Amino acid sequence: EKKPYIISNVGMTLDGKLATINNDSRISCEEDLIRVHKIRANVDGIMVGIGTVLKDDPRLTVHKIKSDRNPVRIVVDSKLRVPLNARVLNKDAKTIIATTEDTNEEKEKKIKILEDMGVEVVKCGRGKVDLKKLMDILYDKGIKSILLEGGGTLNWGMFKEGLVDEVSVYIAPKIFGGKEAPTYVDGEGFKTVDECVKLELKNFYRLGEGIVLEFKVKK
């Protein structure tokens, strides 16, 4: 054990938004979706936060590219708010819901239902999910590479703990605006430049009407 290699990918507007204030996220073009799916096809797991599941109900599977098998889907959900009918819980792939060790009668029942549906539930942390410990658990399961799709709040959590290895960002040629709109990285935020995350621009190229930037995280 140690922890998986983590790639953070996202599609954002020039002003760093992941969606409008009304959750409209038609940012990535077709070319970018193909690129993303190729990445999905090459990792052991895809990780996303409950916030994204609630707002977008994604499948998190390889569907617009030749697919053999799908990577494990991981959802960070502290209070187990994942809707019982969320697509991320369908049978297209294996799914793991990472929640906290906190408990109540209703939560335990929900866990039983999820397990009955073939969904695995991992308890890890108090108050909020302990990402570092979760990485150990996922590594022991054989998941050595994970595509982190976010969104904003989870990304903060991952970057704060320095668990991200590399970053790929697709920047769309548009501007959304909005102090309330979700950005690539939200959460608390670093107080000074000294403690912020450092990166190294490794590669970049246009894709469709936008551009892709690839960075390596300087740990």
Ligand X SMILES: OC[C@H]1O[C@H](O[C@H]2[C@H](O)[C@@H](O)[C@H](OCCC3CCCCC3)O[C@@H]2CO)[C@H](O)[C@@H](O)[C@@H]1O
195: which 2 tokens? 């403690």
Site string for ligand X, 101-140 (x = CB under 6 A): ----xx--x-------------------------------
- Judged by CB under 6 A, the residue of 3, 77, 124, 210 near ligand NAP is 77
Q: Identify whether the C-beta of residue 99 lies closer than 8 Å to the C-beta of residue 121.
A: yes
**Smallest Cα–Cα separation from 68: which of 95, 92, 91?**
92
Q: How far apart are CA 215 and CA 205, in angstroms?
A: 12
Q: Does 50 bind ligand NAP (CB under 6 A)?
A: yes
Work out which of 6, 7, 27, 46 binds ligand NAP, going by CB under 6 A: 27
- Residue positions forming the annotated binding site for NADP(+): 11, 52, 56, 78-81, 129, 151-154
Q: Is 68 in the site for ligand X (CB under 6 A)?
A: no
Total site size for ligand X, rule CB under 6 A: 3
Whether residue 43 contacts residue 146, with contact meaning beta carbons closer than 8 Å, is answered with yes
Please identify, among the stretches 61-69, 76-84, 114-122, 189-197, the one whose residues bind ligand NAP according to the rule CB under 6 A.
Answer: 76-84
Q: Please state, in angstroms and rounded to a whole number, the distance separating the CA atoms of residues 36 and 149.
A: 10
Q: Are 98 and 74 in contact (CB under 8 A)?
A: yes
DSSP bridge partners of 99: 123
Residue 126 site contact among ligand NAP, ligand X, none (CB < 5 to 8 Å, cut-off depends on kind)? none
> Under 8 Å CB-to-CB from 198, ≥6 apart: which residues?
217, 218
Q: Which is nearer to ligand X, 1 or 105 (CB)?
A: 105
Structure tokens, 123: 């308890």
Question: Should residue 154 be labelled a site residue for ligand NAP when binding is judged by CB under 6 A?
Answer: yes
Q: Which of 126, 130, 138 is nearest to 2 (CA)?
A: 138
Residue 131 in tokens = 């990402």
Q: Which residue's Cβ lies closest to ligand X?
A: 105
Q: Which of these segments, 74-82, 112-120, 171-179, 198-206, binds ligand NAP (CB under 6 A)?
A: 74-82
Binding site for ligand NAP (CB under 6 A): 10-11, 18-19, 23, 25, 27, 48-52, 55-56, 76-79, 128-129, 131, 149-154, 157, 182, 186
By CB under 6 A, name the binding residues for ligand X.
Answer: 105-106, 109
